[PDB]
Amino acid sequence: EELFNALPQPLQQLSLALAGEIPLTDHIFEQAASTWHVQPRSLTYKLLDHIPFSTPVVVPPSIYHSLDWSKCFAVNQDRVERVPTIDDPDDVYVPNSDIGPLLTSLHTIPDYGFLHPAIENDATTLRAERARCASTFYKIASSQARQVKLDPIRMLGFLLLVQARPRVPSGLVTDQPTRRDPTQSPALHAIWQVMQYYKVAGVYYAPALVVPSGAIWWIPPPGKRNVVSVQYLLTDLINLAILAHMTDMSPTLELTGVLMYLRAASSHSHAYTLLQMKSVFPALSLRSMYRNKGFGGKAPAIEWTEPRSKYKFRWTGVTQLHDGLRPRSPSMDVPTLEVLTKYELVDIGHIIIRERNAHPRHNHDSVRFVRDVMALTSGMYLVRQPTMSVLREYSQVPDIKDPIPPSAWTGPIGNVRYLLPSVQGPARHLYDTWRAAARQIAQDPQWHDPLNQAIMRAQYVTARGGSSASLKFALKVTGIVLPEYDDSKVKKSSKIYQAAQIARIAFMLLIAAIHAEVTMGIRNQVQRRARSIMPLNVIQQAISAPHTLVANYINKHMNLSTTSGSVVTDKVIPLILYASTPPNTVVNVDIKACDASITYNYFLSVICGAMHEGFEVGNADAAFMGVPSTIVSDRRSSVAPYSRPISGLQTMVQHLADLYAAGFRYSVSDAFSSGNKFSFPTSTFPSGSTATSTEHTANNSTMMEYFLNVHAPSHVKSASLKRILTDMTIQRNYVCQGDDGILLLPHEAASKISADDMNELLTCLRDYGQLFGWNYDIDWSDTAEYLKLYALMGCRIPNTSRHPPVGKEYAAPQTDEIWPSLIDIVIGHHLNGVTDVLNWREWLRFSWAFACYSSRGGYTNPKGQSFSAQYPWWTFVYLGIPPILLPGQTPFIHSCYMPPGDQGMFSILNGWRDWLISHASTTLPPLRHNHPVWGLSDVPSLLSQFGVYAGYHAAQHYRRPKPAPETASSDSINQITSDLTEYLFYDSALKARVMKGRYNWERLSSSLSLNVGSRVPSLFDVPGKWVAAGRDAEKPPPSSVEDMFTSLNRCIRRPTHSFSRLLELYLRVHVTLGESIPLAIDPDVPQVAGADPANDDHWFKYTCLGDIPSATRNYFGESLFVGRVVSGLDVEAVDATLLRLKILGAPPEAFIAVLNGIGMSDSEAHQIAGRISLANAQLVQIARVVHLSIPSSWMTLNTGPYIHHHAYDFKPGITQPSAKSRDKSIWMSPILKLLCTSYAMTVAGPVRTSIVTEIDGSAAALSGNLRVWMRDV
Amino acid sequence: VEALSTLLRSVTPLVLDPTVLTNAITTISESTTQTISPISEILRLLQPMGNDYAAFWKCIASWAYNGLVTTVLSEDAFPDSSQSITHLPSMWKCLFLTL
Amino acid sequence: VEALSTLLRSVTPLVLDPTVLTNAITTISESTTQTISPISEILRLLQPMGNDYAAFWKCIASWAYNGLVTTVLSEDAFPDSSQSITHLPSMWKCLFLTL
Amino acid sequence: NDYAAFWKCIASWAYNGLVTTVLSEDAFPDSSQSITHLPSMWKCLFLTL
Amino acid sequence: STMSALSEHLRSDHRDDASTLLATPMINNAIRSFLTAWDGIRILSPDVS
Amino acid sequence: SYVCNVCNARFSTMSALSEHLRSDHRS
Amino acid sequence: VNDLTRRTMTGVMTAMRQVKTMTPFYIQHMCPTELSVLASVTVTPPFQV
Amino acid sequence: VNDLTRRTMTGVMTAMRQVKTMTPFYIQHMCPTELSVLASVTVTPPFQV
Amino acid sequence: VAMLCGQTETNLIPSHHYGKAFAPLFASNAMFTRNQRAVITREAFVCAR
RNA sequence: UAUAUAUAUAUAUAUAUAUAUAUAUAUAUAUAUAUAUA
Ligand SMILES: [Zn+2]
């Protein structure tokens, strides 16, 4: 491969290491990283010359047809709009224009350019129209290019490097070498052809270059001109090329994707063109697979347990597939082909359909094909001008087909109107439901509990926030002089900052401020319009409390919130799998825009009236959250009007209804556009975070229930449909979360419902939603779409396109981040490639290349010095990336499921133990006195020679700079503290409780001499945590950066030869692997697409353990003792301390002090303390006391039973008696089991039984040291 | 019922405090080598919901209007009919219902 | 046989759930100072070859065609003849056979 | 607010032997159903009236 | 000379050894056990046309 | 296409590879 | 049931039987007075059967 | 067999005998009906001895 | 496991449940085709002999 | 040379899918004729 010869020497070495030829070393690790940072990026394109492509792809010159930008922008009413070219009002995206004329030249790199300083000045100072339009166009065009985790060229360099040389085979019988090869990929050939336009003297000038402040462009010569779309096309091509290789797809499918992108790029508005024909691929493949005759195969047999509210499922065998079970819904070929005819891409459909017809039976190949084809959709984070986005989304109002007549209301109650009893229909149903819930909320001593009140107030504060300026204005307007703490370096717009200002003020004085402006933000998306973030101010968030509370009660006490408890997201996995099984018919539904359709004229007025009436049952004089009862005029009786008191809850409703009727008033201040901030109101619900899911899920459930039980039976025609539609209820037939929803039909007896009845049913539902202005957007394709998860016949399909390898969202014109953060990006990037099942061997190779580039970085003072550093590669091992090849071992023996942290280290060393010991003896002189785990052979020196300690400690170092304090600012720190504590401790009982607990605790901890300095979670530190978070949200000063680099280097250079005490002790255990465990399911049945004999290790791991989490006796430790806690503190810290105390045998008052330290009253403290026992605790619950946790990668596997009865901590016939844990086994055995299973999961291949065989020291010695360490911390 | 209950709780010398009960329960000695500790099972029940036992006052208030409304034991607070007497949580539930 | 079994399994009101048995098992108290736990053994033995639980319907269907085919206990399930009654895993297998 | 059925029945009285009003077949409770199924019970009540 | 040649030798020659310094023969052995279990599955649950 | 590392047998479909792999490779 | 646990269970039940609670006295002697007084205060007089 | 384990074994066996399963009733009363009906449905009539 | 883990709905009425279950299975002439084939088989057999 | 296994090609048979042609039925559009109304 001449390309391998083209690489420079260090990169050739790195490629050899990645191929598994040689063990990786820090030396070559640096040489590769360094040289990448010094050579120009264009050379990566230069590498493409040495690929003899043989693919049938032609790049039409139609691409280079820049449409003039001047006609794509205009300003009216002093705002820069997009003025769409086509008559479609949605063409509001970046056009296809030549950016060239707007460029100057840089002094550093003369070839590339940036915006004219003249243009931006005139747009800023003169507000000149054309200047502003040019600026806006330049800003957004640059931003669209910036939507990548790093420069795409670097990723392309990674792909070439790994693909430059075939990987060496391992000894495994399932290690199939790659079937795909270069010179056959249409993507790379396409990149070659298109890039031929950008060379002048064989130099291959990149069309653009991304920088921290955005992206720069190259000035074209007089002959040529660069269209911004080309850059986007390159990114899509590179992303597709990487994905195709990792997914190992046929070149034909990649060919179709290339043609797909080219056609989109040829026309104007590359983004808009792609967006229009988005769903073509899933419709062609996923929605229509088995609509033929030769159907068959094996399918999972999943059963839903009787208490369906618990969402518990059981795998109970397999089911043979046959024609009677084949999908009933019509295919999707006709509409898709009709759409494709518009863009004359019918060939793509013909190719896809013909290829699809080669999979008549459901098996691994079929789903693998589906996974690959669905991976063809564009992975670009689309971005448009926020001004257009806000103008296009919130300009919608629902259309009600039968409005509530005005005569249907009673007389006013000051603001609200009650609903007349004579009114029926869905509105009546909605009214009663909310009213009933309001009644239940009304009398509930759960509130007025001071602890619960603390939870609600604390829930309102986060590091982020907004609308602070509106807050300061509104209160200053009403004569309220708020405090300030600027010297305490914390952002004013933080929700924390405004909360501190409010602490002292009597609440009712603030009531006028709730009718104030709210700022807004935008977050871009991959396959849809960008999302919206609308953070209310703290006061508004407080007022809306009743709305949330009632919604919560509706959810938690009707359909159990339809999984909106979100305890572990994986509970939806078995649900959709069950929903997609052949015996069941499922329908996917979701509100078209629930945020935009909920409104006051129809919905909120009804809810407000119901809540206000529902609160009538209760003491009319009972203040709630500092809101006192007031007098309101009642005008229900025209003959006898009067005024009566109303409780604080009702007063809240009175104002809340007023606000909703007035409509939200937003203020847009987009930065990408130029000087165009303004404010306009809308009825669109905020819906900026999970706090909105409760309301929409409640209304979603309510309307669905009424439709099923009342509207549909009264209106449908088919008698058979009526027969099956009856005996159906939401609690066992429907789930939802926000707009999203799933509806599944009762099992038709050995049969399926007529599509005719389905059409009748679906039609009526659409009309039902049309009544009150909900577009239901339903579909029926015998698949499962819920929370962006896809299941087909009980097999999960990872939609990889939603996690593009290169793409990353950036919501601001500047990246605003520092170099070390890139490491965390790499770690998160790699995990997705594990969550989604890719070719695990090749994905690992690519990951290391990414890591190598990220391993190095530098910084420069605003005026002064530069700084630099880089990590030894062992860091990434500690961070959770398996090594490819260790010295003395064979490559590719470590599975991706290897746990991060100490566990991964221990497992690696445990396997590597014997070779290290023997090799150290030959190579080095013995150490001077005996070692606990090692002999005299002195492996630690060898590890230092490998730089293991350097990497091990380097990964421990922090990666974000720290802000500095000040003393007059500390007066503000105290002022900030005092007020935060004041806001937290509204009453006095909590303060007395915490103070008593803290005083007793330190007294006990010192006098009993457990230890001193134990940072125990307590409420007094919660404000401190808030303050630190608030100060951290600020951009750090350069001095902090310099401290980081210096500290990091010193930590790297310091010669240390010891791990943490825990890892040192963990090495004392010897673990061995026996035979394979009995299988969970039939290996024939596919469960996750791509986890097949080709991708062996995933296929092994899933097959052995089974995917369905089925903790019938374990419950994965979710039964934490402290169900109710305040924000800021960590439950996982609290229970760990409690168990640690219990193991240490502390006296009960120690528990009492600790519990009282977090607000628990003495009585409940005793009650809680009594529950603490080593028996009822779960394996993971107790094992976490020493930070032994379950890796996130395991959350999709049924590891419970294995850990329970497959990891033998003491097998009688194998273990040495020295390792017998004896009585301490009650808390020793879980630790050993966790270590054992971690090692077993580390190695590749099938899961084997794990057995402790020996502890070098006695088990007693191990337990004693552990108790010491537990007492120390 | 709500009004009367509030009045009752407003004026009463009785104070509900479970500290002595738990103190008298947790002092019972038992082996730590067993796999089930019924003490934990008990204390997992009797969970103080923090409402200061509204049910008790609610039951008392209901008596004044028994001719209009009746208080019933919640269905969920029953032992499942599928269980055996040896299933300890079921037995404790039945005990509480009897009391 | 397969046709009848699948057809039969569609219409029946009976549902199988291993969980109820496991709860009855695990609720048994035991000491932690013993070298062998019968609980773990029987649980390990109790899980079928795969998580199949389909043989039951296969037995029912066979009765309608006993003239054609006869169900027979799987040979591999028999306890090894060389063992003795004190070997607990062998003992459990014998119990399952007679059931 | 139509009540066509009520007037239809009254009108049919004058033309029995030419047109006969009958209770809707699907208004009956399902034969397999049991008395304990309340929605069926209501159907029977309305059917009787 | 190459890791490939070494790996092939390990798979071929030391196919049944149990030395701790070698990993791959054990994993291959485990895979063989895995297959035997797979036979036990379908032997009492075959596939019909 | 797909291939077995022990005998170099080559297969068009993965199902054929699986059945072969499981059944054909075991003084 | 292992007797040790059985011994424990009868123990805790015994402890409950021995707690010197005040409630039973309050029910028999003091609560009726509170009801008798409050019956003249609530906006709705008692309604019993 | 140590009696502690021996006590455990008879305990767990007792637990199994006490489970209120539904299957025995279904076999005696309901399964025959299902067979009797399905006998008229399968493409091949029953063949017994 | 099947013997010991059998359970059903709390208040099942078998006659009702089977009523719904068997409804779609007797909607067509499926059972009669085999009768017709049997007759033709009879005639063919006799003539051939 | 022969046997066995694997791969590829060609021929023949059977099944499934798609396309094209012809016939028949149904729907929609357009033209022409006839009737009726304006
Ligand atoms: Zn082979």
DSSP one-letter code for A1007: I
Contacts for A1010-1014 with beta carbons within 8 Å, 24 or more apart? Answer: A1010/A1144, A1010/A1146, A1010/A1150, A1010/A1271, A1011/A1271, A1011/A1272, A1011/A1273, A1014/A1273
Asked if the Cβ–Cβ distance from I9 to C20 is below 8 Å, we say no
Cα separation values, A1161 from A362, A402, A991, B22, Å: 60, 54, 12, 14
Q: CB under 8 Å to B27, separation ≥6 — which residues?
A: none
Which amino acid would we find at residue A1246? P
What is the rounded CA–CA span in Å between residue A1234 and residue A1209?
10
What is the rounded CA–CA span in Å between residue D42 and residue D29?
9
**Token digits for I8?**
């059903």
What is the rounded CA–CA span in Å between residue A206 and residue A195?
8
What is the rounded CA–CA span in Å between residue D5 and residue A548?
46
Map residue A167 onto helix, strand or coil.
Answer: coil
- CA of F7 relative to ligand 1 center, distance in Å: 5
Partners of residue H40 in chain I, C-beta under 8 Å: 31
- CA of E5 relative to ligand 1 center, distance in Å: 20
What is the rounded CA–CA span in Å between residue B73 and residue B69?
13
Closest CB from B4, B25, B63 relative to G15 = B25
DSSP per position, A560-597: GGGGTT-SSGGGHHHHHHHHTSTT--EEEEE-S-HHHH
Residue F12 CB in 7 A reach of strand J: yes
Residue A294 CB in 7 A reach of strand J: yes
Tell me whether G2 touches chain H (CB under 8 Å): yes
Indicate the length of chain G as a whole number. Answer: 49
Contact in structure between A19 and A166 (CB atoms under 8 Å): yes
Buried b (16+ CB within 10 A) or exposed e, A547-573: bbbbbbbbbeebbbbbbbeeeeeebbb
The three-state DSSP-derived secondary structure of A829-868 is HHHHHHHCCCCHHHHHHHHHHHHHHHCEEEEECCCCCEEE
Angle between helices H31-38 and C55-63 (to 10 degrees): 60
What is the rounded CA–CA span in Å between residue A1076 and residue E29?
10
**Token digits for A1070?**
């010897």
Strands (E), A724-804: 734-737, 740-744, 784-786, 789-792, 795-797
The three-state DSSP-derived secondary structure of chain C is CHHHHHHHHHHCCCEECHHHHHHHHHCCCCECCCCCCHHHHHHHHHCCCCCCCCHHHHHHHHHCCCCCCCCCCCHHHCCCCCCCCCCHHHHHHHHHHHC
In DSSP terms, A790 is beta-bridged to A785, A797
Map residue A697 onto helix, strand or coil.
Answer: helix
Nearest CA in chain I to C10: I21
Please tell me which residue lies nearest to nucleotide J18, judged from CA to C1': A354
Burial class (CB in 10 A: 0-12, 13-18, 19+), B60: buried
What is the rounded CA–CA span in Å between residue A528 and residue A510?
39
Asked if the Cβ–Cβ distance from G30 to B39 is below 8 Å, we say no
Give the number of other CB atoms < 10 A from CB of residue A968: 9
Angle between helices A989-1004 and A1148-1156 (to 10 degrees): 140
Query: A1144: alpha, beta or left, given left = phi > 0 and alpha = psi -120 to 50?
Result: alpha
Give the number of other CB atoms < 10 A from CB of residue A847: 25
Contact in structure between A230 and A145 (CB atoms under 8 Å): no
Residue B25: which of A492, A103, A394, G16 has the closest Cα? G16
What is the rounded CA–CA span in Å between residue A850 and residue C80?
56
Chain centroid to CA A863? 38
Q: CB under 8 Å to A536, separation ≥6 — which residues?
A: A467, A518, A544, A686
Q: CB under 8 Å to A692, separation ≥6 — which residues?
A: A595, A685, A686, A738
Give the number of other CB atoms < 10 A from CB of residue A1018: 19
Using CA of residue A260, residue A264, residue A270, residue A271, what is the dihedral sign?
A: negative
Contact in structure between I24 and A749 (CB atoms under 8 Å): yes
**A409-412 vs A630-634, strand pairing mode:** unpaired
Chain centroid to CA A959? 21
Residue A292 CB in 7 A reach of strand J: yes
DSSP per position, A901-917: HHHHHHHHHHHHHHHHH
What is the rounded CA–CA span in Å between residue A538 and residue A467?
9
Residue A357 CB in 7 A reach of strand J: yes
Contact in structure between A47 and A160 (CB atoms under 8 Å): yes
Residue A1228: which of A1169, A1176, A1179 has the closest Cα? A1179
Give the number of other CB atoms < 10 A from CB of residue A102: 19
Q: How many CA atoms lie within 13 A of A731 on its CB side?
A: 13
DSSP one-letter code for A805: S
Residue A228: which of A41, A63, A61, A42 has the closest Cα? A63
What is the rounded CA–CA span in Å between residue A1099 and residue A6?
37
Residue A242: which of A877, A800, A790 has the closest Cα? A800
Virtual CA dihedral for A935, A938, A942, A945, nearest 10 degrees? 160
In DSSP terms, F3 is beta-bridged to F10
Indicate the length of chain C as a whole number. Answer: 99
Map residue A379 onto helix, strand or coil.
Answer: coil
What is the rounded CA–CA span in Å between residue I20 and residue A748?
9
Give the number of other CB atoms < 10 A from CB of residue A1210: 20
**Token digits for A302?**
């999943």
Tell me whether A176 touches chain F (CB under 8 Å): yes
Residue A1039: which of A1047, A1030, A1027 has the closest Cα? A1047
Partners of residue E42 in chain F, C-beta under 8 Å: none
DSSP per position, A1070-1132: EEEEEEEPPPSS-TTS-SBTT-STTSHHHHHHHHHH-SS---SS-GGG---S--S--SSS-HH
| Ion ligand 1: residues, Cβ under 5 Å | F 4, 6-7, 9
Which H or E run contains H15? Answer: helix H3-18
**Of residues 1057 to 1116 in chain A, which lie within 7 A of strand J by their beta carbon?**
none
Which strand J bases fall within 7 angstroms of a protein CB? 6-8, 15-17
Q: CB under 8 Å to A666, separation ≥6 — which residues?
A: A390, A394, A517, A518, A519, A520, A534, A679, A680, A681, A682
Distance F2 CA to J8 C1' (A): 16
Asked if the Cβ–Cβ distance from A722 to D26 is below 8 Å, we say yes
Residue A290: which of A332, A251, A249 has the closest Cα? A332
Helices (H), ranges, A171-279: 186-195, 228-247, 251-266, 270-276
Residue F11 CB in 7 A reach of strand J: yes
Distance A589 CA to J29 C1' (A): 36
DSSP one-letter code for B78: S
Contact in structure between A1203 and A1182 (CB atoms under 8 Å): no
Q: List the single best residue of E8, E35, E43 to mutate versus F (max F Cβ within 10 A).
A: E35
Give the number of other CB atoms < 10 A from CB of residue B32: 12
Distance A880 CA to J13 C1' (A): 59
Resolution in A: 3.3
Residue A945: which of A928, A966, A924, A963 has the closest Cα? A924
Contact in structure between A380 and A147 (CB atoms under 8 Å): yes
In DSSP terms, A1207 is beta-bridged to A1250
What is the rounded CA–CA span in Å between residue C17 and residue I6?
7
